[PDB]
Amino acid sequence: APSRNGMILKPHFHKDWQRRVATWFNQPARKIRRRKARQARARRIAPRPAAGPIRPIVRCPTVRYHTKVRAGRGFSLEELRVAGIHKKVARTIGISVDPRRRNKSTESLQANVQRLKEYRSKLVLFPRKPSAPKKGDSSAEELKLATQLTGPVMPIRNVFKKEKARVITEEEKNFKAFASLRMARANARLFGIRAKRAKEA
Amino acid sequence: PSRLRKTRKLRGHVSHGHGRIGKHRKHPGGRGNAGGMHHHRINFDKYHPGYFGKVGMRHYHLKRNQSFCPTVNLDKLWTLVSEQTRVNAAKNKTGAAPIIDVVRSGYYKVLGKGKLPKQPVIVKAKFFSRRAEEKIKGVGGACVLVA
Amino acid sequence: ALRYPMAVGLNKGHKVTKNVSKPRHSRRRGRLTKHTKFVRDMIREVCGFAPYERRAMELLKVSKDKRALKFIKKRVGTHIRAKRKREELSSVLAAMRKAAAK
Amino acid sequence: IVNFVHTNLRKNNRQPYAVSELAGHQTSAESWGTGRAVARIPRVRGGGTHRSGQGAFGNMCRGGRMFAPTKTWRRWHRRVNTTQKRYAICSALAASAL
Amino acid sequence: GAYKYIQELWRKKQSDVMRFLLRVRCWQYRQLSALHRAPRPTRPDKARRLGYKAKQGYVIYRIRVRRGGRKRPVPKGATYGKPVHHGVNQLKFARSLQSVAEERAGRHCGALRVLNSYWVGEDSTYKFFEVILIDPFHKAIRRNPDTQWITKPVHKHREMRGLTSAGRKSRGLGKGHKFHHTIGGSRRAAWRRRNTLQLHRYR
RNA sequence: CAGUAACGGCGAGUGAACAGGGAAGAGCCCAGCGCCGAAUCCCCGCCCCGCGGCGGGGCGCGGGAAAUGUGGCGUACGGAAG
RNA sequence: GGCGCGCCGGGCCCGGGUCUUCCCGGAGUCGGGUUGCUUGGGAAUGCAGCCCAAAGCGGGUGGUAAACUCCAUCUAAGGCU
RNA sequence: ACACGUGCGCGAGUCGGGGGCUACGAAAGCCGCCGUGGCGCAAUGAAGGUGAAGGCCGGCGCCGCCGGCCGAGGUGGGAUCC
């Protein structure tokens, strides 16, 4: 029975909820387990990056996040072809591939090609047969400076470009942002019936 | 801390501070929000008006991304661009207005609440209020729409 | 006159140039290859037409192609598959009507 | 701050203790009824041993469970503000010169 | 290619040719026992798709499942509960009759392992399914790198746990807006996580 | 996200998902369509190093599987051939 | 047990890019009706029974039923990890 | 879980709680392009949506509007201060 002025609430505790309580005393021991399983991974892949392969510059979808840039799944096949990268040689030298990623845009396509010119120029490749050099492999001294990269390889920072201070021209001053919004709202909406009553007459 | 609690002052006292006449019985008004229309009508009317009944249109697959439009006012608009710009654009004689990209700061609409200090601005915001435009134009600046 | 790029309107969204590549190989899945056309061309001559189509053939012949469409809809399910079916019953009947006189 | 930050951060190295769910509820008990001159407590089902008809469930019964058995999901740990943690050390270092 | 000609010939089951073949075989299959070994696949073509290679060690049974819905097994139709649970007649078993067929073949031959199954005829009383079985211990399977996955003890009774094709179609999993209730491993795994107090150490 | 959209004598109560931020991160194989003298596969006998996970090699107009389709190439990211 | 530099045994002798002609896919199954169960899923989210039962510029999806349009996105009814 | 009171810290912010980094210690310390995200800073409408001060003084006894300095009220009671 409710006492007085006080919030209405519906506690989700009507099931046998005590049997299925997940207590987090695993947590401090889990972080030890996940860390030892991360160092011993990195110690195996001895000169390779510890985060592993390079991820592409990728826009977030759905208009809340679409001004931000992530690390995606992997590079698209139209990003590997333009870079001169073979899709199955990509995985083996530490380049992320997914066959799924479309390309609706050229700038987001071209962003991930310049991304890969960096990597192949940054790539130190050790010969499979160590004591006999092969062609595509990097020089002897580049194998000797070879260290791991702790952190995501070519880390993705969202950068807005430097706009300067401008004297506002008599045209930009004169633009009516509110009415231009309110006009286009009606032109986006009512078009359907203005196309239909014009095809009529 | 159990020692600081009330149970520690109720040892010796028979009823334990829950009445001697009306005994502390388990659920004497029903479990939870029972009798909201019947025997708790007055509590649910006096403090929770509108609780019972329907209103308006159902919208089945509603995502909170399509309806995302967070607002900055013209009050705190000069906080988004550093103190170094505001003084330089005031001090300089050329009349070059510093560009305030509102989409960069995280907001998609500029509303016109505050009194904007009298130096020209350029606002690259996505949506605008009518009053928000008038103040930017009133001081003497541009309302740049952005996609 | 300046038209700024807007997040709403009849031509809205961000100013981005659009590349045009060859579409991915699964988009053309279930399009009619001539080799696979011949198999259905072969088997239709072997098997015949289903007993629901024999009623559907004999009602198109009296020019009841609505009563056919209402019938084919009931048998095959939707208004969309049935209209596609009826444009394939009449096509093989207009094929017979060439052979009917000649 | 020192006698608040110390008293909450020293709860964070505290291992859980609890009484088992089964502890007390491993009998097949039932109250004899309203008659029979005994106190309506869940007595143990009949036998030729000492337990047969004693009194099984309840906090007051010999054997049995405890009232409100201690749980593993007791809020053992107390998180403090990062700022207050520094404002304890700046208050601890400051008072160990004087 | 011969198989594509049999492929579309099995899609005209309504035809004069296949209203005879599915009718005279559906006669034939009732007179043989409820669960017996077929000497070959009735459909070579359909078994091709479902992974049956015609080498040594691949087994095909031809089992029948009595047709219709599952009625509630209660004495004299009395269900001792609320008017909701009174139902007995018009109830439907969660798994398909095809998956019921596989886990009778798979139950019988415990030494074998169910790969998949396919339809070969229905009556008013009996659906007939050829159930494809593989020897995990015949050295033609056991030494083939692309069929040695079945031989591991992880794939013991795929038919029972519902890891065969018809077995998976009642679990209600797959991707997207339709298959939310089986996000995670299964329906039970989804239910489990969603009904756990994640009582953290701190809060 | 979220006790949110939604369900419900719309009462009691029930109640996801996407995006996002992380842990890990790995990709793939057939059938079908086609080409290669079935080019494939299991088992027995004989000997040889040799194996408390019966395996590698030779050896037989020895048997069997298999054109009602075995092996290779090849699978939606396309693929084959010249 | 855990791994590379050389004696070495059998097996395997393999790739890339463009131009050019050929080829390209799983059916009592999707889908539809009706029924029962399930779901947050609401003119039916998922599952099953039964009846009807397709297509190949197709098919599914596009969270309010439908008809006509455009447009987007995957490629179901086979398998592994 | 909620409401209110009270104590502490910072304050248009604030909080790592999940994650990662480095005997007691499963502790503690740290990260800020780990501040996603939570609640707060904006309300309102079923919704599409919209979304929080102005007087006068000159040009065109008056006009939309070109201007123009100025400017978050008024009243009454108000602890303190002058």
mmCIF file of N, CA, C and O in Angstrom, chain E residues 134-182:
data_model
loop_
_atom_site.group_PDB
_atom_site.id
_atom_site.type_symbol
_atom_site.label_atom_id
_atom_site.label_comp_id
_atom_site.label_asym_id
_atom_site.label_seq_id
_atom_site.Cartn_x
_atom_site.Cartn_y
_atom_site.Cartn_z
ATOM 1 N N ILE E 134 26.013 -41.208 -41.424
ATOM 2 C CA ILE E 134 27.459 -41.358 -41.761
ATOM 3 C C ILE E 134 28.143 -42.143 -40.638
ATOM 4 O O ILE E 134 27.898 -41.823 -39.460
ATOM 5 N N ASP E 135 28.959 -43.135 -41.010
ATOM 6 C CA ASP E 135 29.880 -43.859 -40.095
ATOM 7 C C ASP E 135 30.957 -42.889 -39.621
ATOM 8 O O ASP E 135 31.722 -42.383 -40.440
ATOM 9 N N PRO E 136 31.061 -42.598 -38.302
ATOM 10 C CA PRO E 136 32.210 -41.856 -37.788
ATOM 11 C C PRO E 136 33.501 -42.692 -37.705
ATOM 12 O O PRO E 136 34.524 -42.100 -37.415
ATOM 13 N N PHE E 137 33.444 -44.008 -37.970
ATOM 14 C CA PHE E 137 34.558 -44.972 -37.745
ATOM 15 C C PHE E 137 35.005 -45.696 -39.025
ATOM 16 O O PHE E 137 36.075 -46.336 -38.959
ATOM 17 N N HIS E 138 34.262 -45.614 -40.135
ATOM 18 C CA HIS E 138 34.689 -46.174 -41.446
ATOM 19 C C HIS E 138 35.802 -45.281 -42.006
ATOM 20 O O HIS E 138 35.627 -44.045 -41.998
ATOM 21 N N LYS E 139 36.897 -45.890 -42.473
ATOM 22 C CA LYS E 139 38.180 -45.198 -42.782
ATOM 23 C C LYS E 139 38.075 -44.374 -44.077
ATOM 24 O O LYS E 139 39.012 -43.601 -44.338
ATOM 25 N N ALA E 140 36.994 -44.519 -44.852
ATOM 26 C CA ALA E 140 36.671 -43.663 -46.020
ATOM 27 C C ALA E 140 36.205 -42.277 -45.547
ATOM 28 O O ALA E 140 36.574 -41.285 -46.204
ATOM 29 N N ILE E 141 35.424 -42.216 -44.460
ATOM 30 C CA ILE E 141 35.010 -40.949 -43.778
ATOM 31 C C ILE E 141 36.154 -40.480 -42.873
ATOM 32 O O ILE E 141 36.539 -39.298 -42.972
ATOM 33 N N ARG E 142 36.660 -41.383 -42.029
ATOM 34 C CA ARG E 142 37.595 -41.095 -40.904
ATOM 35 C C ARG E 142 38.919 -40.506 -41.428
ATOM 36 O O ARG E 142 39.534 -39.726 -40.671
ATOM 37 N N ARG E 143 39.337 -40.837 -42.659
ATOM 38 C CA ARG E 143 40.603 -40.348 -43.282
ATOM 39 C C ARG E 143 40.348 -39.235 -44.313
ATOM 40 O O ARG E 143 41.334 -38.803 -44.938
ATOM 41 N N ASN E 144 39.101 -38.789 -44.504
ATOM 42 C CA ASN E 144 38.758 -37.667 -45.422
ATOM 43 C C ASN E 144 38.757 -36.371 -44.611
ATOM 44 O O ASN E 144 37.898 -36.201 -43.748
ATOM 45 N N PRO E 145 39.702 -35.425 -44.848
ATOM 46 C CA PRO E 145 39.781 -34.193 -44.055
ATOM 47 C C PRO E 145 38.519 -33.313 -44.028
ATOM 48 O O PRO E 145 38.399 -32.528 -43.104
ATOM 49 N N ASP E 146 37.629 -33.450 -45.020
ATOM 50 C CA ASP E 146 36.390 -32.636 -45.171
ATOM 51 C C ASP E 146 35.153 -33.392 -44.650
ATOM 52 O O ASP E 146 34.059 -32.795 -44.708
ATOM 53 N N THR E 147 35.299 -34.637 -44.165
ATOM 54 C CA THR E 147 34.211 -35.409 -43.493
ATOM 55 C C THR E 147 34.665 -35.952 -42.125
ATOM 56 O O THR E 147 33.880 -36.716 -41.529
ATOM 57 N N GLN E 148 35.846 -35.560 -41.625
ATOM 58 C CA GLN E 148 36.395 -36.031 -40.320
ATOM 59 C C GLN E 148 35.893 -35.136 -39.175
ATOM 60 O O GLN E 148 36.238 -35.429 -38.014
ATOM 61 N N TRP E 149 35.125 -34.084 -39.486
ATOM 62 C CA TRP E 149 34.478 -33.173 -38.499
ATOM 63 C C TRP E 149 33.317 -33.874 -37.780
ATOM 64 O O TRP E 149 33.040 -33.496 -36.626
ATOM 65 N N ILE E 150 32.673 -34.853 -38.429
ATOM 66 C CA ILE E 150 31.467 -35.569 -37.904
ATOM 67 C C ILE E 150 31.932 -36.576 -36.843
ATOM 68 O O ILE E 150 31.128 -36.907 -35.954
ATOM 69 N N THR E 151 33.189 -37.030 -36.938
ATOM 70 C CA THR E 151 33.768 -38.161 -36.163
ATOM 71 C C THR E 151 34.090 -37.728 -34.724
ATOM 72 O O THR E 151 34.235 -38.627 -33.871
ATOM 73 N N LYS E 152 34.205 -36.419 -34.466
ATOM 74 C CA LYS E 152 34.514 -35.845 -33.125
ATOM 75 C C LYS E 152 33.311 -36.015 -32.200
ATOM 76 O O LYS E 152 32.172 -35.927 -32.653
ATOM 77 N N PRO E 153 33.520 -36.218 -30.878
ATOM 78 C CA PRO E 153 32.415 -36.482 -29.952
ATOM 79 C C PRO E 153 31.471 -35.291 -29.711
ATOM 80 O O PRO E 153 30.442 -35.500 -29.094
ATOM 81 N N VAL E 154 31.827 -34.094 -30.199
ATOM 82 C CA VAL E 154 30.976 -32.864 -30.164
ATOM 83 C C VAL E 154 29.683 -33.129 -30.950
ATOM 84 O O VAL E 154 28.634 -32.633 -30.504
ATOM 85 N N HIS E 155 29.752 -33.889 -32.053
ATOM 86 C CA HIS E 155 28.616 -34.172 -32.977
ATOM 87 C C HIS E 155 27.955 -35.522 -32.654
ATOM 88 O O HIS E 155 27.397 -36.138 -33.585
ATOM 89 N N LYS E 156 27.983 -35.956 -31.387
ATOM 90 C CA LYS E 156 27.208 -37.127 -30.894
ATOM 91 C C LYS E 156 25.734 -36.725 -30.788
ATOM 92 O O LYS E 156 25.430 -35.818 -29.986
ATOM 93 N N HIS E 157 24.869 -37.375 -31.573
ATOM 94 C CA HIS E 157 23.397 -37.172 -31.586
ATOM 95 C C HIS E 157 23.078 -35.710 -31.931
ATOM 96 O O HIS E 157 22.607 -34.972 -31.041
ATOM 97 N N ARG E 158 23.353 -35.316 -33.178
ATOM 98 C CA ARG E 158 22.991 -33.990 -33.751
ATOM 99 C C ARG E 158 21.464 -33.902 -33.846
ATOM 100 O O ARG E 158 20.910 -32.825 -33.546
ATOM 101 N N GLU E 159 20.833 -35.003 -34.270
ATOM 102 C CA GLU E 159 19.360 -35.199 -34.372
ATOM 103 C C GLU E 159 18.660 -34.853 -33.048
ATOM 104 O O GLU E 159 17.578 -34.232 -33.114
ATOM 105 N N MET E 160 19.242 -35.223 -31.899
ATOM 106 C CA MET E 160 18.595 -35.076 -30.566
ATOM 107 C C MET E 160 18.663 -33.611 -30.116
ATOM 108 O O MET E 160 17.608 -33.073 -29.733
ATOM 109 N N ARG E 161 19.851 -32.998 -30.166
ATOM 110 C CA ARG E 161 20.105 -31.604 -29.703
ATOM 111 C C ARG E 161 19.605 -30.581 -30.736
ATOM 112 O O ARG E 161 19.533 -29.391 -30.379
ATOM 113 N N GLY E 162 19.305 -31.008 -31.969
ATOM 114 C CA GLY E 162 18.714 -30.156 -33.021
ATOM 115 C C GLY E 162 19.768 -29.344 -33.755
ATOM 116 O O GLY E 162 19.578 -28.120 -33.889
ATOM 117 N N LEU E 163 20.836 -30.005 -34.217
ATOM 118 C CA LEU E 163 21.948 -29.402 -35.005
ATOM 119 C C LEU E 163 21.857 -29.818 -36.481
ATOM 120 O O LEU E 163 22.695 -29.336 -37.270
ATOM 121 N N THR E 164 20.890 -30.672 -36.836
ATOM 122 C CA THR E 164 20.525 -31.016 -38.237
ATOM 123 C C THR E 164 19.577 -29.934 -38.771
ATOM 124 O O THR E 164 19.046 -29.165 -37.943
ATOM 125 N N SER E 165 19.367 -29.889 -40.090
ATOM 126 C CA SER E 165 18.632 -28.810 -40.808
ATOM 127 C C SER E 165 17.234 -28.620 -40.204
ATOM 128 O O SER E 165 16.953 -27.505 -39.724
ATOM 129 N N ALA E 166 16.408 -29.673 -40.213
ATOM 130 C CA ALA E 166 15.035 -29.688 -39.651
ATOM 131 C C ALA E 166 15.082 -29.495 -38.129
ATOM 132 O O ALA E 166 14.116 -28.922 -37.583
ATOM 133 N N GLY E 167 16.151 -29.971 -37.475
ATOM 134 C CA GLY E 167 16.410 -29.789 -36.032
ATOM 135 C C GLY E 167 16.524 -28.322 -35.639
ATOM 136 O O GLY E 167 16.060 -27.976 -34.533
ATOM 137 N N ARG E 168 17.109 -27.491 -36.510
ATOM 138 C CA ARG E 168 17.408 -26.054 -36.251
ATOM 139 C C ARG E 168 16.180 -25.171 -36.520
ATOM 140 O O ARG E 168 16.129 -24.064 -35.947
ATOM 141 N N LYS E 169 15.232 -25.631 -37.346
ATOM 142 C CA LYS E 169 14.112 -24.802 -37.881
ATOM 143 C C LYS E 169 13.021 -24.566 -36.826
ATOM 144 O O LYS E 169 12.139 -23.740 -37.111
ATOM 145 N N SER E 170 13.054 -25.264 -35.683
ATOM 146 C CA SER E 170 12.102 -25.097 -34.549
ATOM 147 C C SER E 170 12.727 -24.290 -33.403
ATOM 148 O O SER E 170 11.968 -23.862 -32.510
ATOM 149 N N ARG E 171 14.049 -24.094 -33.425
ATOM 150 C CA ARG E 171 14.807 -23.343 -32.388
ATOM 151 C C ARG E 171 14.480 -21.852 -32.513
ATOM 152 O O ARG E 171 14.486 -21.164 -31.475
ATOM 153 N N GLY E 172 14.190 -21.389 -33.734
ATOM 154 C CA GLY E 172 13.771 -20.007 -34.033
ATOM 155 C C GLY E 172 14.947 -19.049 -34.003
ATOM 156 O O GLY E 172 14.773 -17.928 -33.488
ATOM 157 N N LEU E 173 16.097 -19.471 -34.542
ATOM 158 C CA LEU E 173 17.329 -18.642 -34.651
ATOM 159 C C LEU E 173 17.664 -18.425 -36.132
ATOM 160 O O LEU E 173 16.932 -18.949 -36.997
ATOM 161 N N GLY E 174 18.737 -17.676 -36.393
ATOM 162 C CA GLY E 174 18.926 -16.844 -37.593
ATOM 163 C C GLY E 174 19.172 -15.408 -37.166
ATOM 164 O O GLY E 174 19.188 -15.158 -35.942
ATOM 165 N N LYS E 175 19.337 -14.492 -38.123
ATOM 166 C CA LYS E 175 19.755 -13.088 -37.862
ATOM 167 C C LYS E 175 18.590 -12.121 -38.087
ATOM 168 O O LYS E 175 17.737 -12.404 -38.954
ATOM 169 N N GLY E 176 18.587 -11.012 -37.341
ATOM 170 C CA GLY E 176 17.812 -9.800 -37.661
ATOM 171 C C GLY E 176 16.674 -9.539 -36.695
ATOM 172 O O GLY E 176 16.719 -10.049 -35.557
ATOM 173 N N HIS E 177 15.688 -8.764 -37.155
ATOM 174 C CA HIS E 177 14.551 -8.237 -36.355
ATOM 175 C C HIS E 177 13.604 -9.373 -35.949
ATOM 176 O O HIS E 177 12.962 -9.247 -34.886
ATOM 177 N N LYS E 178 13.522 -10.433 -36.759
ATOM 178 C CA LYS E 178 12.616 -11.593 -36.544
ATOM 179 C C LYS E 178 13.150 -12.496 -35.422
ATOM 180 O O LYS E 178 12.319 -13.116 -34.732
ATOM 181 N N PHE E 179 14.476 -12.557 -35.243
ATOM 182 C CA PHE E 179 15.174 -13.541 -34.372
ATOM 183 C C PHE E 179 15.931 -12.801 -33.260
ATOM 184 O O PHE E 179 17.175 -12.909 -33.179
ATOM 185 N N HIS E 180 15.180 -12.082 -32.418
ATOM 186 C CA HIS E 180 15.669 -11.377 -31.201
ATOM 187 C C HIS E 180 15.668 -12.341 -30.010
ATOM 188 O O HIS E 180 16.672 -12.373 -29.274
ATOM 189 N N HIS E 181 14.572 -13.087 -29.841
ATOM 190 C CA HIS E 181 14.309 -14.039 -28.723
ATOM 191 C C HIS E 181 15.359 -15.157 -28.641
ATOM 192 O O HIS E 181 15.400 -15.811 -27.584
ATOM 193 N N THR E 182 16.148 -15.395 -29.698
ATOM 194 C CA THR E 182 17.247 -16.402 -29.735
ATOM 195 C C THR E 182 18.606 -15.726 -29.976
ATOM 196 O O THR E 182 19.522 -16.420 -30.467
#
